[model samples]
Target: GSVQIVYKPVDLSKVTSKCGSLGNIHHKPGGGQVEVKSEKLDFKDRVQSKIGSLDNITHVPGGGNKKIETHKLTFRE
Candidate 1:
């Protein structure tokens, strides 16, 4: 099944700039608000505006390279 919604675009930069990344937060107190600065950021303004133009573009044409990152959670405890 499939449905569609109106394209809603937001400036990731403004969002990142205004919100803390949590990694920058202090936990020792855990009870107050802090105006602490965040790494604050934006993603490529080159982001596609259209909902479906550059679909499934999985490769590069010039000197392409691939990299991967991984994360793990919990333990066998």
Candidate 2:
């Protein structure tokens, strides 16, 4: 079984030079990406899902701004 598909990969190698704190986060490899940073990005305020299988999606990013409702996010996988 190739040992459980190589046992979950997507180690960003500590993501040096800069990683994440406020937003504008990123990744592009296989299928494990998440994004939530905003000043302006809208699909009329989007929503897409496939949550547990790996393509879970959502958007706010100033979800029509004022006080910017969400922050404090960290992922190390």
Candidate 3:
């Protein structure tokens, strides 16, 4: 048997440095955030579901602003 996986495309109009004043320099641990906005279901719905299961959920900054962050994971057969 075989399994098929579907991936949604993503696009970032603008990526501002929300990692605080120090930027990506200082390891703030939980002092960074990203904004992703798109019109794709695979990008918004799928991404939100994944990230919601992570510890970094609290540090997501904001959403529904035509911008949102995405989730990452690995799969194997």
Per-residue lDDT value at 9 in model 3: 77
For each candidate, the alpha-carbon lDDT, in order, equals 0.42, 0.45, 0.51
lDDT (Cα, tens digit) per residue for candidate 1, span 46-71: 67543223233334233434445555
lDDT of 2 at 64: 34
Residue pairs clashing, model 2: none
Model 2: lowest-lDDT 10 consecutive positions: 1-10
lDDT of 3 at 30: 46
lDDT of 3 by residue, 1-77 (tens): 88877888777577445333433333335454555665565454535354322243323443324565778868965
Q: Say which prediction, candidate 1 or candidate 2, comes out ahead on TM-score.
A: 1
**How well does candidate 2 score on lDDT at residue 43?**
58
Ranking of all predicted structures according to TM-score, beginning with the best and ending with the worst: 3, 1, 2
Could you give candidate 2's per-residue lDDT for residues 1-76 as a string of tens digits? 2322223444443322433455665654466655654565455446763433545455535333233244454545
Candidate 2 Cα misplacement greater than 4 A, ranges? 1-23, 27-29, 32-52, 63-77
lDDT minimum window of 10 residues, candidate 1: 13-22
lDDT of 1: 0.42
Top TM-score prediction, candidate number: 3
